[PDB]
Design an enzyme around this catalytic site. Structure first.
Site, PDB file in Angstrom:
ATOM      1  N   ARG A 173     -41.415  -8.333  10.749  1.00 57.42           N
ATOM      2  CA  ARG A 173     -40.281  -6.954  11.633  1.00 57.42           C
ATOM      3  C   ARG A 173     -40.169  -5.877  10.685  1.00 57.42           C
ATOM      4  O   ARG A 173     -41.329  -5.235  10.215  1.00 57.42           O
ATOM      5  CB  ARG A 173     -38.962  -8.429  10.947  1.00 57.42           C
TER       6      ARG A 173
ATOM      7  N   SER B 109     -47.248  -7.764   2.889  1.00 56.97           N
ATOM      8  CA  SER B 109     -47.015  -8.803   2.187  1.00 56.97           C
ATOM      9  C   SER B 109     -48.385  -9.391   1.516  1.00 56.97           C
ATOM     10  O   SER B 109     -49.220 -10.550   2.047  1.00 56.97           O
ATOM     11  CB  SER B 109     -46.772  -9.651   2.276  1.00 56.97           C
TER      12      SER B 109
ATOM     13  N   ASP C 251     -42.970  -6.443  -1.754  1.00 61.14           N
ATOM     14  CA  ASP C 251     -41.923  -7.508  -2.123  1.00 61.14           C
ATOM     15  C   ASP C 251     -41.228  -7.555  -3.357  1.00 61.14           C
ATOM     16  O   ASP C 251     -40.120  -7.578  -3.438  1.00 61.14           O
ATOM     17  CB  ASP C 251     -41.780  -8.616  -0.944  1.00 61.14           C
TER      18      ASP C 251
END
Ligand SMILES: OC[C@H]1O[C@@H](O)[C@H](O)[C@@H](O)[C@@H]1O
Ligand SMILES: OC[C@H]1O[C@@H](O)[C@H](O)[C@@H](O)[C@@H]1O
Ligand SMILES: [K+]
Ligand SMILES: [K+]
Ligand SMILES: [K+]
Ligand SMILES: [K+]
EC number: 2.7.1.1
Lengths: 899, 899
Positions: free
Chosen positions: B524, B588, B642
């Site tokens: 996103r 990630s 993250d």
């Protein structure tokens, strides 16, 4: 037309067939079953949450309260006033507070402080900040609650996303914010969903309301479901409003077959992707944007605006659901279209306008049709619950979309009437809808709050403090002294009569003894064989005999003639007639002992009316009857009191026992006293078991400061008014009557049995010790307690049951405590009597209340400990003090005429 | 004949008609319903007690145990031996111990000491007192029990009356007596009623047994009832043997219409007057005496013996039930009569003998007929439960009366076959009957006892002690150092990579930032507006984009070409295209940071196979793709992890936050380190957030002493064998696999799912974190947990469910603890790093396991407290560290290129 037809095919997937709708209707019905069932609830997407609202306004609603409404299109605050009038309306005012979009995406803290900040201002601007008005709270989000004034946010929906709130109790969070400021004081009595508020607000004007429907920013529906269908809420009586939370319908994939690429894109750009999938196909917060996406795709394909694409047409949020409505107006629809589109930088052609208007039509018609389908599922459900062939109900509606779209209402009703045919549904629209609703629920919540505040005050009188208990113990002790002293005995209420039992068994006892247990229509004779062997052993037999009423009300000469007849039978029954055997005589009637083997009857009881017995010495009446027969001879060694018999029975095994206690229909206690203290009997040497007859404690008013209004009523209506005051706050014969008299009271105030005083409730002695011991049982479920009550003849409900159990509890606790203060005085007197600073004594007890009751003996014990710490007292249930005990008293009796 | 006819009329009331019997049969059926129902059970006279015996011997029974039998005609002790053979019988021996009548009327203490005294002798005389054999106990009295090895005596019946036992647990009372002597050691594994023993003893030889019937001293019947009918026992699967306790039938008045004056007199002279009223009309302990009373009344009326009455005829107990049998023999009946009566001092005439024999007949026939009636009720009940039109079952019988009376058997069967017609019942008689029975139940009890002993040992390996936890914390800390030092970093498993984030937000941050969240097929883009106003506020938007597998396995040039395409879309979506905006890049995948804005990809995961990316710097690949488009330009300020994003996100609000933690599918942690310590980056000034990558802890064997067999299996079968050992004992991606591997094991040992290994049980990843979090939920009922399992595809039972939940619990606790020991090392290193003796630090956490799990976070916290007391650490759930966090890292990033 050509244009319209070109869109119909392009958006064919957004045109649902009735075949499709009915299918969806059916899918939802299944989602409703699963959510209600305890087996599938864990993983069900349609939560079907219990609201803890069991009925709509019954009119009796009256008061003045505030109401908050957060979670919809706008945050408003209302002050509703429902009062008593002669068929005239209710007053209320509201105020909308702006809530920055960057506030509903912030921290829970800021959000609730904002709500608090807005609250205080509202009340202050109205200066009603002084009178702590009840506060109602309409929060439109899925909440978990086990009671009206609790609301654990399951998750956020629509446009809220404040952190630190999900999984927490918004009420505490709000109370937290209201405190931080401390500007005022708020009373959040209830928290309700907007669907609930709507159903309430409309049920007030129509007692036929069973469904609340919201169609605005978000969409949701609540209805009235049968408790016997709500597996996750204990109960089975009445109804409870269920909050379906149908916006999550399909969040598990169930609807992927009817969702389009536009539906999925709308989801990807949403705050809560993957959630509220059904809602995102229906509610107003998404309709506008859904049309925009469809328009962007078409321009991109040169299907509209001749492929011209502008920065505005591509910007999210530029086409509002309000443009969808403006465009679908019958009059100025196409003109509104041209204006709107033009404002988007596009240069629309007449063809473009018609097309864009048909996209709107197709998108909003789907919303309508989809909600008709799911609502229809709720109607069919209601039709099934009521077993009626055709359904008649009223639906409470609200929502910006439904109320402002020119065609929604009509399309929705049309489709609905076609899917759910055998039924006539009434649709009531509401002004604030959830403004007056939260108020009606708040009203009831406050009501029940006062009932509890009141009930709590009434039962407070029954709460004795450790200091009062010490006074009671103090007073009992003084009473004891007056009864022992020769100068005041005749005027003492606690008689402290001497039993003439100068010693507890010592083990030396050996022999065969007879006992007569007379205390009613059914007395018994007994043979007790006692062997003082290396190992203590005692065996006994006994037969029960009846006394014909005709003889009970006989001539006393026949009464004792009959009794000796029964004894004559027994001796043969046991095959032992012949010898002159020793006999102990337990006489359980108001007697006065003048010697171990003599006792004058002061008055008959339990139906006996035999003549020429009262005032005479019962042992002589018996000896006279024996001799009259001349068949055999006995050696009546003693007349016995069952309480004294209970201690003896206990002492036989536990040598540290010098106190007996009876707590059953009546209550009494005895203990070994020092002869120097028994001023009524000559001789300062040795001891003497005293029969207190302590039930008369308080008969001279010394307990009059701890007795209640209900204690007085029980006395007033008792057969022996003014007498046995102490025994009346402790014996199993009255406990129920104190209880019953409280219930009647509460029934009148209307806190029980619907204010209806039952005939069974008017019957005295309806609450026996047995049933008193059950209701308070730890191993009993409330549904059983309720069954028991209803079994007595009381139309009690699960709620009534909770009440009755509390009362009982309050009464039986005080009983044990008041009993403890009493017992506490005896042991200490014994300790001090022997000039000790530590005493270990065991007490032998018996009695159906002490024995059968779940908590009496325990609380009793705890209490004797607190008030008498210099004493280590042990309580042993000792039974048959009337038979075995009378024999032991006899054995000790003959044994002592030897010394 | 004339004589016989004269008795028939005299005792007409003892001659029940079939009309009467059927009525009684019906009354009992109702008493059975009430006792089973939770609504009427509270006040029901037929207790219908659950025995907790769910099946009869399946043959698989084998072992060597003892058996006690107390409460019947005689107290015997058996040593039963059920072993494996080729169709050959079972061995057993018994011994009867005399129990003085004055012992069963004494104290509970003496009685159980007697039983103990008799036990030890039995074993000693057999010298098997060394091998602690399991002990079975057949106690024939109504007992309350919630498990096979517990038995709370409701009340005494027949001829027992030992005090201090009623209301107590006889097992504890016995264990109490066995201890007092300490001569030996007994294992009372089970307590069963004699009816249960009989049903078991006979079901062993006949798998059709569903009823146990006792007709001797006392009378009682037990049967196999449907769990879905036993309201007072949670469950619904299978059957449970119910102990009706029908001797109390009528104890509430229900039978007064069929009881005679003789029945009532028998009661008056009984030990337990008013109880066991039905039993007193049937059992052998009363038959004899009942006839005597009838004879006394007749002599008294000169109807027998010519009115001659003797001291013997009137003595209770002189006419035994054994005389009733002797008299009713076909051969010598009347001769036996003359002898018996004559021994009574009477001088019987031939007429007298015939008459006395007919009284016996009439009295014993009633016993038979009455028991046929009530048994028939149990048969009809069984017929209804099985829904079969005609019933076929086998009844296990026993009792001195039934086995010794010459006519009972025959009369009983005849009457029974006439009342219950549509059924063929098989009556199996048993030698000891309850001797071999208690043994079969004991057998199963022992079995399940070992399973639990075993299961408990297996799960013990998962129990970490506070000392092991300290070592783990010790070892983690050492690992940390190796990774920070430049001399050992390349060989360290806990890499301790620098994030290049030199400062947490300080509030000064203000601006509009973009973030890219790439960690799978669905990544996103986001816009985050940060305003450093008086009041901290941050708003954001984000759209999700997919990456076609075709592109995932594309050329890396297309992958980043596609991504920039999505970003190009978003900028238009937000209507902000044009300017050169700052962007944080959350990547990630296994990366190695060489600078804040540079990170080399060490390997693709999650299905990505894009070529020419591995080994290249992802930020350059992105910058290259952006430039290739030439549509716009961005300022990639950082590449983000993250976990680091999670701390930053938390620090923004809670300034004491310097540690981030992720516990979800994977696990990682970060914390602010002192630059002087980061030997890998030049500069001893300032700080540096370190990305530990602590999941590799233990990858060099340092945890090999705390890892189990199941931990090893999980590794062996994992995709990355030998790697991520720590993350494998803590992450939600493996917890279920440790669990599943234990279940399989237990299934094989046959402790679960009937030893049957399911295909679903063979599927990996079947136990997701979501379902792991549910099964352990406090708000879930075992019947729901069982539903969940069955919903997964596991044919689990209520029992299986209890097991699976325990395993899960064991595994998830260790996970939290092992996680705590880890976290505990970080905070302390920070404390000591800054040379403090007290540190207050907050930790920002995220992860589906930490968040969704009922007990993980709690136990985790408790643990960090114990191991690190010099630290006051606070845990805050911080979400969206991948979006909001990446933006905050960017804001701090640009802010620092100014200083
Ligand atoms: O506002 C209408 C409805 O919107 C839904 O998204 C919420 O979950 C409900 O609580 C609410 O009733
Ligand atoms: O001995 C046969 C039966 O006698 C009854 O009095 C007892 O209550 C039962 O426990 C027993 O099964
Ligand atoms: K229910
Ligand atoms: K004196
Ligand atoms: K059940
Ligand atoms: K350095």
């Amino acid at each position: 037309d050509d244009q319209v037809k070109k869109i119909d095919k392009y958006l064919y997937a957004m045109r649902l067939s009735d075949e499709t709708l009915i299918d969806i209707m059916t899918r939802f019905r299944k989602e409703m079953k699963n959510g209600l069932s305890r087996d599938f609830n864990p993983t069900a997407t349609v939560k079907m949450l219990p609201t803890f609202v069991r009925s709509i306004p019954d009119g009796s609603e009256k008061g003045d309260f505030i109401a908050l409404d957060l979670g919809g299109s706008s945050f408003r605050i209302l002050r509703v006033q429902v009062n008593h009038e002669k068929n005239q309306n209710v007053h209320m005012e509201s105020e909308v507070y702006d809530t920055p979009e960057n506030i509903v995406h912030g921290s829970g803290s800021q959000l609730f402080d904002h709500v608090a900040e807005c609250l205080g201002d509202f009340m202050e601007k109205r200066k009603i900040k002084d009178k702590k008005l009840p506060v109602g709270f309409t929060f439109s989000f899925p909440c978990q609650q086990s009671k009206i004034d609790e609301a654990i946010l399951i998750t956020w929906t629509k446009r809220f996303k404040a952190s630190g709130v999900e999984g927490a109790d918004v009420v505490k969070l709000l109370n937290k914010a209201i405190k931080k400021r401390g500007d005022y004081d708020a009373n959040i009595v209830a928290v309700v969903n907007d669907t609930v508020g709507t159903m309430m607000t409309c049920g007030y004007d129509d007692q036929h309301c069973e469904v609340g429907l919201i169609i605005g920013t978000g969409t949701n529906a609540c209805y009235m479901e049968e408790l016997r269908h709500i597996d996750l809420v204990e109960g089975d009586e009445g109804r409870m409003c269920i909050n379906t939370e149908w916006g999550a319908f399909g969040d598990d994939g169930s609807l992927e077959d009817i969702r389009t690429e536009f539906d999925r894109e709308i989801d990807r750009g949403s705050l809560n992707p993957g959630k509220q999938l059904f809602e995102k196909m229906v509610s107003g917060m998404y309709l506008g944007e859904l049309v925009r996406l469809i328009l962007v795709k078409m321009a991109k394909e040169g299907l509209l605006f001749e492929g011209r694409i502008t920065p505005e047409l591509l910007t999210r949020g530029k086409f509002n659901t309000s443009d969808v409505s403006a465009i679908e107006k019958n009059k100025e629809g196409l003109h509104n279209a041209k204006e709107i589109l033009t404002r988007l930088g596009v240069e629309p052609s007449d063809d473009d306008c018609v097309s864009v208007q048909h996209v709107c039509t197709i998108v909003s018609f789907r919303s309508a049709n989809l909600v008709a389908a799911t609502l229809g599922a709720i109607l069919n459900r209601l039709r099934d619950n009521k077993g009626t062939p055709r359904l008649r109900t009223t639906v409470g509606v609200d929502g910006s979309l439904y109320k402002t779209h020119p065609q929604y209402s009509r399309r929705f009703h049309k489709t609905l009437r076609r899917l759910v045919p055998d039924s006539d549904v009434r649709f009531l629209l509401s002004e604030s809808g959830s403004g007056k609703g939260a108020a009606m629920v708040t009203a009831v919540a406050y009501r029940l709050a006062e009932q509890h505040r009141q009930i709590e005050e009434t039962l407070a009188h029954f709460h004795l403090t450790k200091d009062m208990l010490l006074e009671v113990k103090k007073r009992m002790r003084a009473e004891m002294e007056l009864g022992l002293r020769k100068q005041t005995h005749n005027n003492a209420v606690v008689k402290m009569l001497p039993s003439f039992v100068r010693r507890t068994p010592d083990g030396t006892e050996n022999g065969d003894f007879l006992a007569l247990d007379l205390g009613g229509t059914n007395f018994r004779v007994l043979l007790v064989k006692i062997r003082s062997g290396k190992k203590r052993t005692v065996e006994m037999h006994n037969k029960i005999y009846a006394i014909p009423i005709e003889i009970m009300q006989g001539t006393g000469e026949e009464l004792f003639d009959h009794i000796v007849s029964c004894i004559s039978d027994f001796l043969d029954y046991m095959g032992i007639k012949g010898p002159r055997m020793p006999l102990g005589f337990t006489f359980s009637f108001p007697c006065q002992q003048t010697s171990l083997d003599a006792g004058i009857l002061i008055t008959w009881t339990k139906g006996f009316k035999a003549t020429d017995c009262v005032g005479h010495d019962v042992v002589t009446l018996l000896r006279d009857a024996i001799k009259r027969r001349e068949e055999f001879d006995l050696d009546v060694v003693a007349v016995v009191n069952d309480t004294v018999g209970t201690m003896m029975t206990c002492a036989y095994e536990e040598p540290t026992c010098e106190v007996g206690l009876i707590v059953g229909t009546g209550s009494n206690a005895c203990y070994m006293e020092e002869m120097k203290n028994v001023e009524m009997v000559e001789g300062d040497q040795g001891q003497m078991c005293i029969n207190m007859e302590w039930g008369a404690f308080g008969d001279n008013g010394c307990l009059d400061d701890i007795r209640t209004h209900y204690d007085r009523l029980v006395n007033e209506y008792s057969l022996n008014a003014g007498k046995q005051r102490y025994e009346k706050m402790i014996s199993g014969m009255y406990l129920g009557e104190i209880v019953r008299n409280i219930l009647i009271d509460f029934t009148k105030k209307g806190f029980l049995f619907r204010g209806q005083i039952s005939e069974t409730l008017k019957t005295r002695g309806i609450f026996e010790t047995k049933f008193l011991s059950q209701i308070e049982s730890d191993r009993l479920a409330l549904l059983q307690v309720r069954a028991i009550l209803q079994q007595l003849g009381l139309n009690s409900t699960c709620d009534d049951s909770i009440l009755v159990k509390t009362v009982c509890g309050v009464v039986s606790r005080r009983a044990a405590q008041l009993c403890g203060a009493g017992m506490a005085a005896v042991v200490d007197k014994i300790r001090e009597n022997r000039g000790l600073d530590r005493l270990n004594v065991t007490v032998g007890v018996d009695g159906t209340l002490y024995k059968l009751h779940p908590h009496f003996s325990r609380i009793m014990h705890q209490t004797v400990k607190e008030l008498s710490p210099k004493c280590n007292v042990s309580f042993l249930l000792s039974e048959d003090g009337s038979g075995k005990g009378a024999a032991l008293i006899t054995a000790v009796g003959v044994r002592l005429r030897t010394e």
